[PDB]
Write a protein that binds this ligand. Structure first.
Ligand code: HEM
Ligand code: HEM
Lengths: 255, 255
């Protein structure tokens, strides 16, 4: 476990005040949906996810409050299969886990095993949050435009355009048609993950990449468009630059 | 039309001797399969394709020898649809052509209209040479390895690896899994286009990108593996560097 005040600290992004890990937990427990943003290959993020999950799980189970975990890394189409794994929990062994969940190898198991193991064997159910491969391929090949009010603005789409252009080093002029397709795919992924979170009957934590959890361009906008009255809280695990507007709490690593 | 000796010239790549356009034609007429390699957005290539097609078409039709054109830009799965267009030739007007052929818009019509119009309205039939989108998606998601002797060597695959890496500016280390998928897709495209050419009962010209027509890494290797006794000839429309081993004739532009 990372050492608080030696290895990391936490800011409330609204006030920019440093807040204890315990005090952040007490606040997160108030939320109905907790978004946890990560960099997918970042080891310190993976440790942080276990610490936060463990503290929330312990408190909620001791109160008999249901608490589930949605994963950008599993599709929502997989839920029937995942419910079976939840049912057969005691029958799936640590090395059978990836097969039970039908883990997709686009997501390197190494980068997920620690968190997903702790999640899977607690009282939490794992939810698939995302689009399927087939769904993503279908959007790319051209489907009807996503409707929205705050989540689909030109401003959001352009921010997503430039982020993806930079992520893939794709010249905005040469690669215009491709980038607009990738933007629409991000928008659709965000909508689906929001759909899963908005309709869920138990308190829920999402693990997803930082661009997805961002309050500026991501899932939070789509939750708003769904007209949810759920209390939403966003915790981002920092890497590189920190935009306070992206989240409600940020973990900052030493550094 | 480009002016011979002012705008372009032709080398026999075996001898590196300059050869007249008329003398190249007389040789091409001897072949059963003529591969014509292009750069897809290059205007002078497009003019060159019309000149070569016209000279071959005129000679062969005057002899009542059937002569057809296969296109990397249409899938072989489309043939039933394309045979209907061939049948309804006199009923499809210049502006209905793209709809009759079910043209895929990944290929910019502007870059194909001149050649495809001249082809479509002659006595030639248009053949789909390539994989379908669905076929390409299925290979990407993982299918069983292509078998071959000369066409699937590590040497060929590595050349394709580096070509694609450079074409897309994809760092060989970071993007290793992606590049191997793209290599396998090229290999499959080459195999299918070869399959179409090898089994065709009439003399045939293929239009395809230069990497596909290359005798070093492309379709010619797959034709060999099919054990065809057809006479094969490769004509490349140059751009940038010229590797003599890529083709049997090369058009060189001024320059
Ligand atoms: C994420 C979902 C994606 C899907 C479903 C998808 C699917 C496809 C399909 C079906 C094609 C047509 C294949 C062909 O005609 O040869 C294609 C082509 C292409 N794609 Fe995507 N792709 C995706 C992501 C990406 C990304 C992230 C990039 C950029 C890094 C990209 C870059 C390209 C390029 C440059 C081509 C041109 C094909 C070539 O000549 O190599 N794609 N893709
Ligand atoms: C040519 C046929 C292609 C097909 C069928 C295809 C399809 C796909 C699919 C189904 C995914 C998974 C989507 C996801 O999990 O989000 C994907 C991801 C990806 N693809 Fe391809 N693609 C093709 C070509 C390309 C090319 C040419 C490039 C490079 C220029 C490329 C680069 C990428 C990258 C970087 C991703 C990671 C997804 C992301 O995080 O944005 N693809 N592609």
């Amino acid at each position: 476990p990372l050492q608080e005040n030696k290895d990391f600290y936490i800011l409330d992004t609204h006030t920019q005040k440093k807040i204890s890990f315990e005090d952040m937990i007490l606040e997160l427990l108030k939320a109905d949906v907790i978004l946890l943003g990560e960099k997918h290959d970042e080891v310190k993020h993976k440790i942080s996810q276990v610490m936060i999950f463990n503290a929330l799980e312990g408190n909620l189970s001791s109160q008999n409050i249901n608490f589930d975990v949605a994963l950008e890394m599993l599709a929502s189409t997989e839920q029937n299969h995942l419910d079976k794994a939840f049912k057969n929990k005691k029958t799936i062994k640590a090395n059978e886990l990836t097969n039970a969940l039908n883990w997709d190898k686009v997501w390197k198991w190494k980068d997920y095993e620690q968190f997903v193991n702790v999640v899977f064997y607690s009282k939490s159910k794992i939810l698939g949050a995302n689009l399927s491969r087939s769904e993503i391929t279908s959007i790319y090949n051209g489907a009807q435009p996503l409707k929205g009010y705050v989540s689909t603005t030109n401003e959001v789409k352009k921010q997503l355009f430039d982020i993806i252009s930079l992520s893939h080093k794709l010249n905005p002029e040469e690669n215009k048609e491709l980038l607009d397709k990738l933007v629409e795919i991000q928008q659709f992924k965000d909508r689906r993950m929001a759909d899963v979170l908005v309709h869920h009957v138990n308190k829920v934590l999402l693990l997803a990449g930082s661009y997805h959890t961002s309050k500026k361009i991501g899932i939070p906008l789509h939750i708003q468009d769904f007209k949810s009255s759920k209390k939403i809280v966003v915790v981002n695990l920092s890497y590189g630059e920190i935009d306070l507007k992206d989240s409600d709490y940020v973990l900052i690593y030493k550094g």
